């Protein structure tokens, strides 16, 4: 079964840095594209970033692009998200999604997520 077990999170003040991960077991990780999807405590879903198959083509959103990076490790099956500058609005759950077979994704599978502040 497709399973995405995240890690990281915690209580970090503004201007700091983080690194999340995603376990991604149950399928060939190095074939599919990946994504980070966030959910505010106001209960609205927003998009963060996508990374392609080999890590070549990367799409960020507007409120992410200046200060976050996304990467992956196809031999350790992990899916990272380095954070910086933490401008007091990103206090989400940060789900780890599996992208659909296609040109822009529609998020077939999901994960539990890690609370950040």
């Amino acid at each position: 079964e497709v399973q995405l077990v995240e890690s990281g999170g915690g209580l970090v003040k503004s201007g700091g840095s983080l690194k999340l991960s995603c376990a991604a077991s149950g399928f060939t990780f190095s074939s599919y594209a990946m994504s980070w999807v966030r959910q505010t405590p106001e209960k609205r879903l927003e998009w963060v970033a996508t990374i392609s198959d080999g890590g070549r083509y990367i799409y960020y959103s507007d409120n992410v692009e200046g200060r976050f990076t996304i990467s992956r490790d196809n031999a350790k099956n992990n899916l990272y998200l380095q954070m910086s500058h933490l401008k007091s609005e990103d206090t989400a759950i940060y789900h780890c999604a599996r992208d659909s077979s296609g040109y822009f994704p529609y998020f077939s599978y999901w994960g539990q997520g890690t609370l950040v502040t």
């Binding site: 296609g102 040109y103 822009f104």
Partner: protein, 132 residues
């Protein structure tokens, strides 16, 4: 992988057309996966097949093989339902040995995807001009 909808974008001579392929199961008799379009009549569908064959006691090589069939339709005088007039095929066969690593197999996949968008090959296929 697993059969799901392979929605392909940026298709066409201009590059604005899309195509969604809905899966139609795997044939157990020869191990050929099948994708097809969302038509009702089965002779008006754009279908894609794909199959990889293990090395038997005769062939000794792995063989990925992808086929593409696109029909076009038009109705004639004194006829009601559209028939099928043309067929534009495609037939890609890969071949690797037992000792090839996966980076050798991913080089050939991404080389062929980059040749098809080069001005030497978009002139021999769109315009039908030999490379001279």
């Amino acid at each position: 992988a697993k059969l799901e909808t392979v929605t392909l974008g940026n298709i066409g001579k201009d590059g604005k057309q899309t195509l969604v392929l809905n899966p139609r199961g795997v044939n157990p008799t020869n191990g050929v996966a099948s994708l097809s379009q969302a038509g009702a009549v089965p002779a008006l569908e754009k279908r894609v097949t794909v199959s990889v064959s293990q090395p038997s006691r005769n062939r000794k090589n792995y063989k990925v093989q992808v086929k593409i069939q696109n029909p076009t339709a038009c109705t004639a005088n004194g006829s009601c339902d559209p028939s099928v007039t043309r067929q534009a095929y495609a037939d890609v066969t890969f071949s690797f040995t037992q000792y090839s690593t996966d980076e050798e197999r991913a080089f050939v996949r991404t080389e062929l995807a980059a040749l098809l968008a080069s001005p030497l090959l978009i002139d021999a296929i769109d315009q039908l001009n030999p490379a001279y």
